[PDB]
Amino acid sequence: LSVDEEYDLWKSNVPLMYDFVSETRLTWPSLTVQWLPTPVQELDGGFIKQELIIGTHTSGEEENYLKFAEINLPKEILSNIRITAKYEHEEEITRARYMPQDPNIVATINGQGTTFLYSRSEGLQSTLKFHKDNGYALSFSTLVKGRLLSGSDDHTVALWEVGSGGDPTKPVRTWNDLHSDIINDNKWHNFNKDLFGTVSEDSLLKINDVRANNTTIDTVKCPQPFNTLAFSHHSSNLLAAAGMDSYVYLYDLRNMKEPLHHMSGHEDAVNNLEFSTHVDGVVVSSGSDNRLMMWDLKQIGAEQTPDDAEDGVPELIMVHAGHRSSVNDFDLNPQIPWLVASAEEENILQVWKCSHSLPIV
C-alpha cells in the first residue's frame, strides 16, 4: 500500500474502531503535545472542553510560538479546535510541559538547549540557560513542586528548582558524567521523589538518585539506544523503555540485569512512551513507523488462537494508523481515559479515543 492508499483504508474503518476522531491541520508542525489538567466542564451547546499545549517548528522562516489550544469535544465522549493563547518563543519548541502542582506554569526547552518558564496569564517569565545544544528531555517531579530536570544533545543533565521564590535561572545541580553522548530522555519516578532515569545515545539506561554524591544506582546496557522511558503510575518498581530497535522493554527496578520482557510491533524506532494513569498495565508507544500502539502488560504471554497470533502479540490492544508521517509526540488525557492527542511531522494533530467495545475499556 501507499501511505495515502492506507490512510483512506484507515478512514473507512474509523467509525468501528473509534468513539471519536478529529483531525487538525496546523500552520506549522508541533514537536510537543500535552493535555492540561483542566477539569471536564460541559459548555452551552452540549460540548465538554479540554485544553492542549502545542508548539511550533518553522526551521527559521517565521517566529515560533508556545500555543494554548481549546478542544471542544462531544458530550458523549464520557467539534473544532481553538487557540486561546499564543506566546512568542526563542527557537522551536522541542518539549513543553506544565507544572503538576501549578498548571499556570509551562516549562519549555528549545533547539539550543535553552529552558523557559512561561506563565499562562503573563507570558515569558524566566530563561534558564545552561545546556549549549538542542534538548528533547524535560521533566517535572510530580512529588516535589518546582523540581525540574532537563537534558541535552551535549550530554548534559540539569536539575532546577522553580516552585518557590529566589532566582530559578540557575541550576541547583548539573551532571557532565552521567552519559557520554546525547541525552535522549529523562523522567522522575512516580513514588520515589529522589529517583530519575536517563537514556542516552551511548546505549546506557541509568537509574539515578539526586541525594547521592555518586548519583547513579543502576546502569543498564541497551540493545541499541533507547529514545524514551516511562515509569508506572501504579507500580513503584515497573518501568518501560524503547528506542532504535523498535521493541518496547519492561524492567523491574529491583533487578535491572535483564529486562522483564519486550513487546514487538513497531517497524522502526520508538520515540515516545507512556503508562496510563487510569489503567494499571496499559502502555502506549509511538515512533518513526508513523504509528501509535497501545499495550496491555497483563496479556503478556497470554494464550491465543493461531488466527489471533497473526494480528500480533497478545499484549497489543490497538494500533493507531491515522498519521501519515512519523509521530512527533502524543499525550494521554488525564481526565478522560483513552482520549489521546497525537501529532505528526506533516502538520497534523489528531485527537482520538478508541472504541468502548475494546475489552480493555
Partner: peptide, 12 residues
C-alpha cells in the same frame, strides 16, 4: 536518536 524534521507551511 530522534531526527528533527525540516518544517513546512500549509498549502492554504
Amino acid at each position: 536518536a530522534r531526527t528533527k524534521q525540516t518544517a513546512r507551511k500549509s498549502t492554504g
